[model samples]
Target: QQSRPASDPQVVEAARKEGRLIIYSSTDQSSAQALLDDFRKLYPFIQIEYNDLGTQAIYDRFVSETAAGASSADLLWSAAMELQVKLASEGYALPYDSPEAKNWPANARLGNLAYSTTLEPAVVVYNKRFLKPEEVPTTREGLARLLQEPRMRGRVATWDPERSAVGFTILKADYDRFPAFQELARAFGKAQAALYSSTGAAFEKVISGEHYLAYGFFGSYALLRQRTVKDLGIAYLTDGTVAIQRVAFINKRAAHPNAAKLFLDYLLSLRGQNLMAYTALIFARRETVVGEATPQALYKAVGGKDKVYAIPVSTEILKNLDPAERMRFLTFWRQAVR
Candidate 1:
């Protein structure tokens, strides 16, 4: 129902010459800045205007921009794959067929419109100074038992399920994989995990030793912490952990269409994947294997191979869930986590 105005090559060239490339993203700002820095080194002529907001906020801006016919962003990148896919289906994104796309896993590419640029693993992170390896919870059952220990009460932190796409996806995993999730919910209920609105806040608490453990923290955060916080350790639940693909899509009405396409090409290229690897971000393309500098032990601890669990539900299936069912799930989760 929404459409972008006709693009002018002369205007695009003028914008490019002005060296401005706007992006709306939900990724960590500093890390994104580093990536853009590398992009600038390669292009040397373009400047980036990046806005880091919550995924929902980014979506709202995209819709508002489309309606106003004043879209400025050249690309949209987010960890909320399902929501992004919905946008692609609605024709908000321009279909881009990158040269390196064939090397990406089939599941990582969405119907020739968008391509997943990274893989994010949701894992359990804990303060090594506070918990021993033997004391660390390796599975959901182990976590449940730890919650029973009085010393751990109020020692777990997590992001709010309603506000965090990662938190919501983690809850979806619980519903899909465990038939006895109610029992696990009851155990979590007793722990009274401190809920924050952002993953960064939750990780900060864990790093500060305010909490012994944190749940649903993404791999990228863990990697970032490893540089400054030596006591923090991350592990994938032995029972199962969910891995989601994070995608990047080009805007159909990009103010700089050529620049957008070039950026997409670079993202799928080996150079982009290598940059991601340096930051400990997982790449969707198989050709871009992580370098030897990455800690193999930490990688193995977080779903190295056998522990990786992929959700079978397609984007369409999640989009089709009854509105009532969706509301009920949210309501139940709010109460259980409270």
Candidate 2:
């Protein structure tokens, strides 16, 4: 295999001798583990110590470790673009120019410190058994209408914005669309929707029909489940949907810098992209499609030519919000579902 960084025989041998790489990630553990497994399969000589945590938790740990000047992690990967941007700005990331990254979209890279390797769309999923086709909402207005229906009462689940990057981004989209999102928040507060801490938990409830609808489940997961779960269906709202770019950054002071750089090259390589596609995880390559099992009609429904929104507001923007304002926004979001 042609390795970048010239794969110096001495450095490669030394890295293998070290035998371990530490990674902190916020991606789905199964998918992340699969990638790690693939790396181990190829290298065979290196061991990986992985930490899968919530995006915020991972960011906190990364920051804390970097602060103590005892940074041991080889890589930091997550769906939290804003957080990664912050890290890059603060010089916590190592600058690497990977050859494989040339295949990605231009916006994927941030000053050579971090780059996106996957694309995931936030989608709305509903229980097929409980909701008739006509009754299922296809737009944001339709979602509002569905929520008002008596049958949907206490049957909708969503991630809590305060705890989840996906949840916060979705809620931000909601607020941006409807100035009356505060009204929706009030509705949510009235017991119309249940808030959960993780997307997986919310999806589990939706799959079981405990919750008839769930927002914030990735399109990839929805497509994968649709093959086995007859009662689950997904729709990308007509108004707009958010497609986030997932990023990976090498630690500036990594204990295993060569390994970190190598792993990133692998992540952006054809083999890595194929692995992601085969496992129904979104890879950043525009030509690659992951969910082949997704019905053509359903895929069309969710894959319109509408413009997807970008994360215009920076982390600095989020940081500027006072505690009271943050709480008020969360409270409003809680009420909106009720």
Candidate 3:
């Protein structure tokens, strides 16, 4: 009901007048530079100020800043799916229905306030030099079995969900969809899997031979790294693969509201999605956006969509933030991992 065309002349004029947009995001600056540069090119009048922060840090900063009546970000983007939804639902977001909204799948957006910008599946990465073809696993069950082997003991890695919002989201989604996920969690503990807070850390351990395989790694990072790191191979679990989508929204108190709207729409545009998919090596959520990182390409690479679970960008994700549920999952997680 609150949809507005991003190209509306009024919006363009207002945005040009503002001439500046500030963002607080969890995406690494290096990975997002190409997209940002293109946005700057399209809207040259707008000076972009982007701050890359941790997932939790982004939410904390925004919440505190808003409460203290201090200047805050114009846009918020991060992989902490639940937190973004929480902020939006709690009135921290400004609803703007971009023209691009027509192309966005229902699951990729929460009304006009929030939208998912990328499709990053949770993947298992292994060092090709260390893991034989036969040793590679296509299913979580197979991975569980593999980790139990003598050679794999103390030589596997995964994200420490307790410390990483991305890790917790993916694993929580996994727990919900994969019936045997608890078994895999127990296997991880039994094998003494090393845990790192970021996907890159776990990935680096695998590449260095300190760890042969890593679970809970982002497919985008894995695909990008493999181009230069030839020894790396990614596996989309045949049993189930949880797609991690990064959510974005405009701040309710945006100083440059119109500029933020323009930037948000640009981010959801076909060209912007292409830059993210091809240049950034991050997956595009739009099915028609052809690229190496499009959802269709991932389905083809993994065999089918029957097992690929894309986490929806909706209030449902907030269940992970419920105190009792969070405690339950965390407790079970700790017990299983230990």
Candidate 4:
């Protein structure tokens, strides 16, 4: 199956017989539904059922069902790369030998179990209507500056690491790469930072001018909103920001394994990746696809690709997944924000 195309008659036949696929996904339905629609057109026999849930919820439910040896989900597509990679590393995924694998980068897959779907940045979104160009902060240091200022108090918003799985991934990865985060966190608390549980909710506050600036908002969501909210401004954070991939993996206990493989291959295909670029405001390719959001394009925009910390969808993330390590991390997180 390693070299077999998605058109393999035997697999396609099996998929057709299965006739159904269920995905527990964290990506916004509006962004991912088009990919499903196109897949339906290609294999009219296959019916798709999708659940748009939070990252932690998807992982927790999948783990619960897995422990019970129950058929719960066929695939998991989420922005939380660490969670996906951890589960795949722990032998929960069906290692699909997708033919489209050749089209992806070296880091895209973890032993063919987990696949990186799109490049999503941890970004900063601000209300440009209230803040001047000079007042707008471009990097994390600039964010710290804004927070340390007297007038900016309570006007800054950030993600609550404990409640948001994606938020935790972003902040943890950022602090790992940059040494200045502790200072920034202290400044954040000094500004009386308003913490929220999700990017969309935090952005809603920013749009209403309830918060002048929000850190670590997902890049795709920010771009999606900027089109309608002219006052909203998205920053690339010249000081360096992490760009994580939205990855997908098939469950080992899938009731419709063949169909799940088909969906995984289709989701990683160029056509599927393009859907994200054109509509979802993310880049899946190294070269230009639909617009300037491509990896190289955005890399240049934000200084360079070296400035972007791309998390590996591999067991690399398992370092902090350990019980003892996670407890220490949670303690440190609390101390950092205290």
Model 4 ranges with Cα > 4 A deviation: 1-9, 285-288, 327-332
Off by over 4 Å in 2: 1-18, 177-191, 283-305, 310-335
Report the C-alpha lDDT of model 4 over 116-222, residue by residue, as the tens digit: 88777877788988787688778777778778778888788888988877777788888888877777887877888888997778888888998898888777788
Model 3, range 1-338, lDDT digits (tens) per residue?
A: 22323566788899999999999999889889998888877778999899999998999999999999999999999989999999999999998888877878888999999999988888888988999767888888888898789888988898788888888888888888887788899999989988889777787788899998888888899888988999998877777778988999999899999988888887788777878898879888878778779888888877887667889999988889888878877898899888
TM-score, cand. 1 vs. native: 0.86
Highest lDDT: which candidate? 3
* Tens-digit per-residue lDDT, 245-278, candidate 1: 6678888988776667667766666667667667
Clashing pairs in 1: none
Q: How many pairs in model 3 have backbone atoms within 3 A of each other, for residues 3 or more apart or on separate chains, i.e. clashes? A: 0
Candidate 1 Cα outliers beyond 4 Å, as residue runs? 1-20, 280-288, 292-299, 302-306, 311-314, 320-322
**Clash count of each predicted structure:** 0, 14, 0, 0
lDDT (CA) per prediction = 0.69, 0.68, 0.86, 0.80
Ranking by lDDT: 3, 4, 1, 2
Q: Is candidate 1 or candidate 3 better by lDDT?
A: 3
